[PDB]
Amino acid sequence: KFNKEFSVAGREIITLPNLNDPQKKAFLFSLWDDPSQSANLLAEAKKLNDAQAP
Amino acid sequence: AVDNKFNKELQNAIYEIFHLPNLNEEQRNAFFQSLKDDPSQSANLLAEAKKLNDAQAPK
């Protein structure tokens, strides 16, 4: 399940500018644990990123 | 027994491997699969990844 789509989703997580390292690590773990949840996880991470906007 | 969600060593290894600058995508993904196959190998696989990263330095 670790293919090109996985790489894209992981990059999307780590480039969210307002998440901190523990948060990105946690999202990346969740993606690794279930790559089929990428859409839900990416939407969750973006929502949290926006909640943390300066 | 350490469950994956409760395993900081596995989670840190995934995060560090994803950041390594000199691996290719195939290497990264192979490490992620090897971690899935046996999370007790996190320390060994992270060390192997850093070794390959350093061997593959562009200068």
Residue numbers in the entry:
A (entry chain B): 4 to 57
B (entry chain A): 0 to 58
What is written in the article reporting this PDB entry?
We adopted the Z domain of staphylococcal protein A and its affibody binder dimer complex as a model system. We next generated libraries at the interface of a weakly associating dimer (Z+ ZSPA-1) with micromolar affinity to determine if we could affinity-mature the interface by coevolution. To clarify these inter-residue co-variations discovered from the sequence data, we determined crystal structures of 10 coevolved pairs that spanned a range of cross-reactivities and orthogonalities (5 from LL1 and 5 from LL2). From the structures, we could verify clear compensatory changes between the residues showing the most significant covariations (13A-9B / 17A-31B) in both LL1 and LL2 library mutants.
The highest affinity mutant from each library achieved approximately three-log enhanced affinity, KD of 1.99 nM for LL1.c1 (LIFFK/FILF) and 1.86 nM for LL2.c3 (LVLF/FIIV) compared to the original dimer (KD = 2.92 μM). First, the binding preferences of the two highest affinity pairs from the LL1 library, LL1.c1 (LIFFK/FILF) and LL1.c2 (LILFK/FIVM), are nearly completely orthogonal, so we focused on investigating specificity-determining positions of the two variants. The two mutants differ by only three amino acid positions (positions 17A, 31B, and 32B) but have virtually no cross-reactivity with each other. Z-A sequences of LL1.c1 and LL1.c2 bind to their own Z-B sequence 500-fold stronger than when mixed with the other’s Z-B sequence. Due to the rotation of Trp35B and Trp35B-centered hydrophobic packing induced by Phe32B, the N-terminal end of helix 1 and C-terminal end of helix 2 of Z-A tilted 17° closer to Z-B. Furthermore, the compensatory relationship between position 17A and position 31B is clearly revealed from the structures of LL1.c1 and LL1.c2. Taken together, the synergistic effects of the geometric change and compensatory mutations found from these three specificity-determining positions resulted in biased specificities of the two high-affinity variants evolved from the same library. We also followed a single mutational three-step evolutionary trajectory from LILFK/FIVM to LIFFK/FILF which are the two high affinity orthogonal pairs from LL1 library showing similar thermodynamic trends. A dramatic thermodynamic transition occurs when Leu17A was mutated to Phe, to produce a less favorable binding enthalpy compensated by a more neutral entropy in specific mutant (LIFFK/FILF). The common mutation in both mutants, Leu17APhe, may act as a new anchor residue, thus leading to more entropically favored interactions between two proteins. For example, A-LILFK has more Z-B binding partners (B=77) than A-LIFFK (B=15) from the LL1 library, and A-LVLF (B=53) and A-VFLV (B=42) are also more cross-reactive than A-IVFF (B=3) from LL2 library sequence data.
